[PDB]
Amino acid sequence: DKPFLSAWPSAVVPRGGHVTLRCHYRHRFNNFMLYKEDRIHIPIFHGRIFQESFNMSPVTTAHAGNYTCRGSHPHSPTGWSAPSNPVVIMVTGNHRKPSLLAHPGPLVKSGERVILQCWSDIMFEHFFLHKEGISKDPSRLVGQIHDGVSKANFSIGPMMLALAGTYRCYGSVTHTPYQLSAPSDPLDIVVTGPYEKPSLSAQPGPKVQAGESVTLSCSSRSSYDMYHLSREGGAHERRLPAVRKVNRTFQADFPLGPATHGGTYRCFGSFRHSPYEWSDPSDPLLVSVT
Amino acid sequence: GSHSMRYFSTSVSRPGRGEPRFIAVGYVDDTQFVRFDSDAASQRMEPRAPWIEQEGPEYWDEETGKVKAHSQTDRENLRIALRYYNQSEAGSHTLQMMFGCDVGSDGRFLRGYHQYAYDGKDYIALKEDLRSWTAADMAAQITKRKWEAAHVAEQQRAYLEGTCVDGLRRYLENGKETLQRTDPPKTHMTHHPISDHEATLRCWALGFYPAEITLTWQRDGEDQTQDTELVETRPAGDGTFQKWAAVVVPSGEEQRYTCHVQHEGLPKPLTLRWEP
Amino acid sequence: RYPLTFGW
Amino acid sequence: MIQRTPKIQVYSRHPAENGKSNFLNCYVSGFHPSDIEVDLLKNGERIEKVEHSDLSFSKDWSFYLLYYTEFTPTEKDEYACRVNHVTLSQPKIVKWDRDM
Ligand SMILES: *[C@@H]1O[C@H](CO)[C@@H](O)[C@H](O)[C@H]1NC(C)=O
Ligand SMILES: *[C@@H]1O[C@H](CO)[C@@H](O)[C@H](O)[C@H]1NC(C)=O
Numbered sequence: 001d002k003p004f005l006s007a008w009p010s011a012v013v014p015r016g017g018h019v020t021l022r023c024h025y026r027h028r029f030n031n032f033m034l035y036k037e038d039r040i041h042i043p044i045f046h047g048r049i050f051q052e053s054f055n056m057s058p059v060t061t062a063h064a065g066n067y068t069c070r071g072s073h074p075h076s077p078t079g080w081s082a083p084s085n086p087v088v089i090m091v092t093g094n095h096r097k098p099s100l101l102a103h104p105g106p107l108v109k110s111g112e113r114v115i116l117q118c119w120s121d122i123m124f125e126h127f128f129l130h131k132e133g134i135s136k137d138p139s140r141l142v143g144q145i146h147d148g149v150s151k152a153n154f155s156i157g158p159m160m161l162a163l164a165g166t167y168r169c170y171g172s173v174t175h176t177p178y179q180l181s182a183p184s185d186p187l188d189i190v191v192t193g194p195y196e197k198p199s200l201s202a203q204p205g206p207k208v209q210a211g212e213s214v215t216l217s218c219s220s221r222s223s224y225d226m227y228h229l230s231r232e233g234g235a236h237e238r239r240l241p242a243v244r245k246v247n248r249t250f251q252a253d254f255p256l257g258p259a260t261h262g263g264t265y266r267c268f269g270s271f272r273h274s275p276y277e278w279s280d281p282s283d284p285l286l287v288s289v290t
Numbered sequence: 291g292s293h294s295m296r297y298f299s300t301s302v303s304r305p306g307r308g309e310p311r312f313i314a315v316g317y318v319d320d321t322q323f324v325r326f327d328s329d330a331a332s333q334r335m336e337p338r339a340p341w342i343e344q345e346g347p348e349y350w351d352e353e354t355g356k357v358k359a360h361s362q363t364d365r366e367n368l369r370i371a372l373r374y375y376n377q378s379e380a381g382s383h384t385l386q387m388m389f390g391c392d393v394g395s396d397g398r399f400l401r402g403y404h405q406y407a408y409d410g411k412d413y414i415a416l417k418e419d420l421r422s423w424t425a426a427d428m429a430a431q432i433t434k435r436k437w438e439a440a441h442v443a444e445q446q447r448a449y450l451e452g453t454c455v456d457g458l459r460r461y462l463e464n465g466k467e468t469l470q471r472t473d474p475p476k477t478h479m480t481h482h483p484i485s486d487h488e489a490t491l492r493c494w495a496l497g498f499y500p501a502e503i504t505l506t507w508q509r510d511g512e513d514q515t516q517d518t519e520l521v522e523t524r525p526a527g528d529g530t531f532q533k534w535a536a537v538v539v540p541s542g543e544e545q546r547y548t549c550h551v552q553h554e555g556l557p558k559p560l561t562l563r564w565e566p
Numbered sequence: 567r568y569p570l571t572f573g574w
Numbered sequence: 575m576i577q578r579t580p581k582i583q584v585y586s587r588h589p590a591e592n593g594k595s596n597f598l599n600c601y602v603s604g605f606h607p608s609d610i611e612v613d614l615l616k617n618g619e620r621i622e623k624v625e626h627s628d629l630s631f632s633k634d635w636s637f638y639l640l641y642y643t644e645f646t647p648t649e650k651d652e653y654a655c656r657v658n659h660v661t662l663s664q665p666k667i668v669k670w671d672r673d674m
């Protein structure tokens with residue numbers, strides 16, 4: 001019937017990298033022709049038939065486009081299949097990277113929402129939000145213009161594990177929509193819960209004198225493999241492996257060094273091989289500095 | 291007397307051949323009544339039996355929501371299993387889920403099930419008390435440790451004892467005439483000569499419901515359970531089932547062998563003898 | 567009735 | 575990896591009686607993994623008008639499928655089921671024995 005077009009290892013590919021288009025049809029990656037969607041019904045490359053794969057390497061801006069393939073069908077009225085599913089090759093690294101930040105924050109309760117805003121002093125027409133590792137096409141929004149910046153609000157939610165991970169975003173100017181900016185700095189989005197909260201304590205305790213060093217200890221009866229300590233409002237985020245103590249409590253001890261000043265802290269448990277889903281936050285603990 | 295409800299779901303990865311595919315199917319006894327196909331155009335839980343076609347839109351709205359949620363959870367589970375087993379993102383893999391319940395004809399709970407397999411072997415399963423999990427390998431004990439910290443068994447036990455056995459009761463009433471009927475097996479025998487000293491007696495059971503049935507051969511009144519050939523019960527296609535059993539008999543000794551058919555639709559078991 | 571499902 | 579080859583059964587829904595309408599069944603079961611290709615043949619030619627059950631499995635996790643089509647048996651029209659699977663190098667053809 002209709003072939004399956006796929007890009008490996010991903011359709012969002014940086015300029016100078018490599019991507020391979022394969023057209024699986026009739027139980028084989030057999031010979032096929034390619035069609036970009038400005039010329040729907042005549043094949044690109046002057047009718048070139050591809051033997052196995054189409055390896056584009058190195059990737060140029062010319063490779064950016066919206067592709068469909070037809071597989072070879074010898075014993076058929078016309079010699080070829082129906083058009084495949086479309087695949088958009090997006091070439092990154094053509095403009096300065098925009099900015100990406102999450103509202104209200106990157107730690108999202110399960111089932112709730114979060115806003116990912118991309119903005120730039122470059123005036124982009126479209127913004128693209130993309131989670132790393134998934135082969136779903138990135139989400140596109142039109143860039144709103146406001147006092148000399150282009151921006152767009154991506155709504156992520158209601159929060160599930162399939163939506164947690166590393167997000168980057170991109171911009172495209174008006175006439176090269178498949179040519180994307182350099183990726184913004186990555187932003188990790190974490191779903192919290194519904195794993196039971198750990199407990200957070202301080203030793204010697206929560207009140208410390210200036211210049212003196214305190215440590216925070218996260219503990220749980222559940223077998224978390226790592227613990228994450230978050231200062232409230234701050235970007236001070238660390239992670240530590242859990243250790244089985246003498247009873248089967250799992251614990252990690254976060255030292256804070258000399259206390260310039262102290263805020264409130266929370267801690268989360270996370271499990272092995274799943275780093276973007278954390279437990280519910282611990283009870284808050286405020287460290288006061290005299 | 292006893293009745294059962296089961297949901298079977300299959301999630302399959304196929305890199306370069308298509309996007310991951312999810313198929314779920316619902317059974318009461320031996321009768322399928324719903325299906326969901328992630329690759330179908332509907333994108334909805336579909337009726338597959340006449341007696342459930344009459345549930346309200348809110349039923350189909352709600353079942354579709356949770357089966358689509360399952361179809362998306364188990365497709366992220368395929369990705370996690372690659373990390374658990376350090377497996378290539380290039381190979382294709384299977385994730386199977388079985389869930390359901392038994393009730394007696396007294397009407398209430400006897401047993402619940404909620405188990406998983408990865409690439410065709412056991413992964414994790416809720417055991418009989420509905421309070422703990424059995425993990426088949428080191429990877430499933432990570433899932434067990436997660437599910438303990440999330441108090442999952444407590445939620446699935448509540449669903450099992452509540453929404454599930456009382457949905458089963460509604461289905462049994464809505465379709466009792468098809469689900470609680472018993473169509474008896476029509477029987478006959480065939481005779482094929484293998485050799486000059488060898489013959490094959492085959493005994494047929496056709497058109498019976500439910501699928502459970504017993505075919506036993508007897509020579510001068512004791513069983514030949516390792517000498518009889520038994521085939522898997524097969525669906526007729528109309529909601530009934532078929533099965534046959536065969537003996538290899540010394541030629542001229544057909545008189546010796548009797549076939550015995552037991553089934554709930556039969557008042558008494560049948561004992562059948564061959565003649566040319 | 568179709569159940570809840572949880573992540574691995 | 576677990577790989578089970580399919581058990582194949584091809585048969586009619588009703589006792590076959592020539593010139594009277596019936597359904598030809600091919601029941602594949604006990605196989606893993608789930609990807610499988612099943613064709614019903616009339617004199618060795620792939621029959622169109624073929625439906626199949628929704629993919630399910632038994633308590634051992636092995637899959638089963640019923641492929642069926644409406645047919646009218648005749649005396650020497652010869653029917654068969656052609657099955658291909660990862661465990662089979664060439665397609666397996668089991669003929670419908672009316673008189674089994
Ligand atoms: C790619 O082309 C298809 C039709 O060929 C169209 O439906 C789809 O919207 C296009 N994608 C983009 C991103 O333009
Ligand atoms: C986008 O999100 C930000 C932060 O939540 C908010 O201030 C703003 O009003 C939203 N909408 C637009 C159009 O920027």
Ligand SMILES: *[C@@H]1O[C@H](CO)[C@@H](O)[C@H](O)[C@H]1NC(C)=O
Nearest residue numbers: 219244245246247248249251
């Ligand atoms: C378990 O023992 C550890 C010793 O490392 C101790 O810190 C912890 O307090 C004990 N558990 C509880 C609940 O107190």
